[PDB]
Short mmCIF file of C-alpha atoms (C1' of nucleotides) in Angstrom, two decimals:
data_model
loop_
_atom_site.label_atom_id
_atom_site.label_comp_id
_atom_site.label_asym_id
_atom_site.label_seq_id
_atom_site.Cartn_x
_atom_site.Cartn_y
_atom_site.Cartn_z
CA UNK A 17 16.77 22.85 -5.75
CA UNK A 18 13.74 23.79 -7.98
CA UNK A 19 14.80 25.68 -11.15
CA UNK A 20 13.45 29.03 -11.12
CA UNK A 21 13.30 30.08 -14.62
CA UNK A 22 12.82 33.38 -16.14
CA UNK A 23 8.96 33.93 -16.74
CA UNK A 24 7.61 32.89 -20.73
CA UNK A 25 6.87 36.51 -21.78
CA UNK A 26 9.79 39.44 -20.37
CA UNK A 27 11.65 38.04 -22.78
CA UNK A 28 10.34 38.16 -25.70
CA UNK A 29 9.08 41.59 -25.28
CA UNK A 30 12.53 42.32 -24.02
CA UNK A 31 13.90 41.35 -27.94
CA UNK A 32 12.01 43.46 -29.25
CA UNK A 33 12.34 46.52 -26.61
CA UNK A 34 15.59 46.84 -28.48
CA UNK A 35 15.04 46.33 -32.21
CA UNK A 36 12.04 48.64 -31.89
CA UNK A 37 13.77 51.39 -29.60
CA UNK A 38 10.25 52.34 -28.15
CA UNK A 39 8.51 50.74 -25.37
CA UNK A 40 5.27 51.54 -26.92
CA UNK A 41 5.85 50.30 -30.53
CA UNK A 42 6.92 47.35 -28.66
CA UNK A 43 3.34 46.63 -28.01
CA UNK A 44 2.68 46.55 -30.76
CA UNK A 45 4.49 44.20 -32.49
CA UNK A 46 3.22 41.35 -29.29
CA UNK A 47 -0.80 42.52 -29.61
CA UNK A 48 -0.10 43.66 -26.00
CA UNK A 49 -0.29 46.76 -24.01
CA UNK A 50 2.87 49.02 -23.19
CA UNK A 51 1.79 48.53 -19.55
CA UNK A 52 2.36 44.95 -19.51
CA UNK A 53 6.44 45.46 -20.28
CA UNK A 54 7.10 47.49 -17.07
CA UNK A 55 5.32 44.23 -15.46
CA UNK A 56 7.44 41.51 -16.50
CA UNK A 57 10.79 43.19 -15.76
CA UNK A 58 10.93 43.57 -12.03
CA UNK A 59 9.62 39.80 -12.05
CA UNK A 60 12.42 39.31 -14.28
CA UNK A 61 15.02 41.26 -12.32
CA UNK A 62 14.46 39.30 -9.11
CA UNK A 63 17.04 36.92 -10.42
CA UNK A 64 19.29 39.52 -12.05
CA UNK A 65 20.03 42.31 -10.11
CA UNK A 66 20.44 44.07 -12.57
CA UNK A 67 18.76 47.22 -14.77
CA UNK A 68 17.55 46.51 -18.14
CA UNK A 69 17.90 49.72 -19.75
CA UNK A 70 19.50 53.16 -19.33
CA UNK A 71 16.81 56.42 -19.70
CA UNK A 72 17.29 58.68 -22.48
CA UNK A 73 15.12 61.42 -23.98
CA UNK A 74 12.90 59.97 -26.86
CA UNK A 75 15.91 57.26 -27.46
CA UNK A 76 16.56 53.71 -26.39
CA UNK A 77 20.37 53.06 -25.31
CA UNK A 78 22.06 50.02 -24.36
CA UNK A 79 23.48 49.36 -20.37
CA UNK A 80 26.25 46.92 -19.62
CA UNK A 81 24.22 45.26 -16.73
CA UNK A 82 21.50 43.70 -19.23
CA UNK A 83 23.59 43.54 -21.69
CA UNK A 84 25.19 40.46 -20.41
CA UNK A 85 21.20 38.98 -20.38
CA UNK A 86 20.60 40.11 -23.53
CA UNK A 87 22.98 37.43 -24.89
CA UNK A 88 20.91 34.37 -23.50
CA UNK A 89 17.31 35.10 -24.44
CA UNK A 90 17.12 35.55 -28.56
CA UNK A 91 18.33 31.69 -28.96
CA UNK A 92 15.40 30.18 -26.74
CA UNK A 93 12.58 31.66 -29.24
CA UNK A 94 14.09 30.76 -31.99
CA UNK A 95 14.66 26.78 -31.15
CA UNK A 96 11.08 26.48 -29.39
CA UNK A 97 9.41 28.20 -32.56
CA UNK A 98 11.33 25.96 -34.38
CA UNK A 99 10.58 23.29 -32.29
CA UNK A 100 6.62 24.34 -32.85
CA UNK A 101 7.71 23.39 -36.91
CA UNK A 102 9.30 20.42 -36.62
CA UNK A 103 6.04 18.38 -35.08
CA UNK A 104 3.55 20.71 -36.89
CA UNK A 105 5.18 19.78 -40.16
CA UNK A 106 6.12 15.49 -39.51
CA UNK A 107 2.00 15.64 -38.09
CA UNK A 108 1.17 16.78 -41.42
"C1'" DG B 254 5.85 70.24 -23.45
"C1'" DA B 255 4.43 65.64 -24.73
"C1'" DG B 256 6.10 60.84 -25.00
"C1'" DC B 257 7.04 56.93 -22.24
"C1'" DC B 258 8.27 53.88 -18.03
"C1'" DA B 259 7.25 52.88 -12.68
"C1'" DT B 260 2.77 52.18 -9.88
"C1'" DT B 261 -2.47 50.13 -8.52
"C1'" DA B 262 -6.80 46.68 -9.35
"C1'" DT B 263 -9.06 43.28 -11.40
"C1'" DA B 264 -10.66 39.40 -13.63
"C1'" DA B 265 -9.44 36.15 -17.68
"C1'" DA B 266 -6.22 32.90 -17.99
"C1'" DT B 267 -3.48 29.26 -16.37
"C1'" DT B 268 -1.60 25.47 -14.32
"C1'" DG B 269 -1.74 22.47 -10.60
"C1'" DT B 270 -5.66 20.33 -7.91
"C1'" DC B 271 -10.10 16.41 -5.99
"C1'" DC B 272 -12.82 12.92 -7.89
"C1'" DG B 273 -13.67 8.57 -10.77
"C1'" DT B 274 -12.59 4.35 -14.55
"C1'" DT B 275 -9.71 0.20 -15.98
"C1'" DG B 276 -6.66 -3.64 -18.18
"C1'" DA B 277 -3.45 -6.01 -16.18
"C1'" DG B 278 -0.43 -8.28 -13.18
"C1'" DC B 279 0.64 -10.08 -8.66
"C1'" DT B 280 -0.95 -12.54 -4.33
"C1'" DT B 281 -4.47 -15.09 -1.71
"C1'" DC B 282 -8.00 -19.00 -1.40
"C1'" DT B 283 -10.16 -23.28 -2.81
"C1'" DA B 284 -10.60 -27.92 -4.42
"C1'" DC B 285 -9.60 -32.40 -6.26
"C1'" DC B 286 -7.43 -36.51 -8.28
"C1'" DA B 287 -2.86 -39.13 -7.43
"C1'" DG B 288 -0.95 -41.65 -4.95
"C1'" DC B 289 1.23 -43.32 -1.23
"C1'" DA B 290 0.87 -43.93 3.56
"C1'" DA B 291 -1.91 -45.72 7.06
"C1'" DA B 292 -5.72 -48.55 9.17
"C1'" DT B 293 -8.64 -52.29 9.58
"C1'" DA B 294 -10.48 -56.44 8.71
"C1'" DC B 295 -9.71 -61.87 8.62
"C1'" DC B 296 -7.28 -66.48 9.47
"C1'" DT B 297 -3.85 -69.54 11.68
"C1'" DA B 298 -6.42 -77.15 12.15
"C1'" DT B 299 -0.21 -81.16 17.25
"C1'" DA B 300 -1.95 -80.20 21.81
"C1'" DA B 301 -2.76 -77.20 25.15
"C1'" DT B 302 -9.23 -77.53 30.01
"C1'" DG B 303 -10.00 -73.78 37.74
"C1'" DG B 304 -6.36 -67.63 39.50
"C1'" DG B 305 -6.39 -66.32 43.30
"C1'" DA B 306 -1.35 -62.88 43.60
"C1'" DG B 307 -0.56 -60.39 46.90
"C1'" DC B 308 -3.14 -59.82 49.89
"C1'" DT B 309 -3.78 -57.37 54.53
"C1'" DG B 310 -0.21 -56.44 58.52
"C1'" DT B 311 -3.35 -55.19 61.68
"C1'" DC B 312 -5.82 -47.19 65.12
"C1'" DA B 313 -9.94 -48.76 67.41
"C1'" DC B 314 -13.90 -45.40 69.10
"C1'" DG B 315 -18.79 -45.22 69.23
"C1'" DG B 316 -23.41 -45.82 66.71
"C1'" DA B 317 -26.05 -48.44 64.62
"C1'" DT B 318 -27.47 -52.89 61.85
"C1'" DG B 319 -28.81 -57.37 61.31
"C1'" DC B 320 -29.18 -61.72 63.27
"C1'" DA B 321 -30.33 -66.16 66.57
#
DNA sequence: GAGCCATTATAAATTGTCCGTTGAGCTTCTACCAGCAAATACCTATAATGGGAGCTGTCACGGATGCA
């Protein structure tokens, strides 16, 4: 069975959807577009079922169903940027 | 009312493709001394001096053939 990972970039972009609270500052943060977020999350959601985010008026809120998903995504960055240190710094 | 998330299109990117090279390691093909097996030559000095070798066991016409 071939192991269908989440794609490489909803979810970074989906860290910072909620530190920022704005879909459009959190284009800015990835020298992206804010059309490029709405992209990644249906890909994304394929595997999920589930909606990301709950609408509110000028205001970012937090929904049970990602919430869960939330929870697995902000420790992959961190070891793989690390990971980008460790050989970067032992080549030099 | 204006900000911001679903839609639509495209090409720049992006990752898995067709083509080649190569050191090396494994599987053939060849040959050639060793060496043993095999093959081939040569000599033997008491004396030895004419077989048939089993016939063939018989049909029996014709047409020549060669003599006398």
């Amino acid at each position: 069975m071939s192991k269908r990972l989440p794609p490489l970039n909803a979810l970074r972009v989906f860290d910072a959807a909620a530190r920022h609270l704005s879909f459009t500052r959190a284009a800015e943060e990835l020298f992206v577009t804010q059309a490029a977020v709405s992209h990644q999350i249906k890909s994304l959601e394929d595997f999920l079922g589930l909606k990301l985010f709950r609408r509110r008026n000028r205001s970012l809120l937090l929904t049970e169903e990602g919430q869960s998903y939330f929870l697995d995504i902000k420790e992959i960055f961190s070891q793989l940027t690390e990971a980008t240190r460790k050989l970067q710094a032992r080549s030099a």
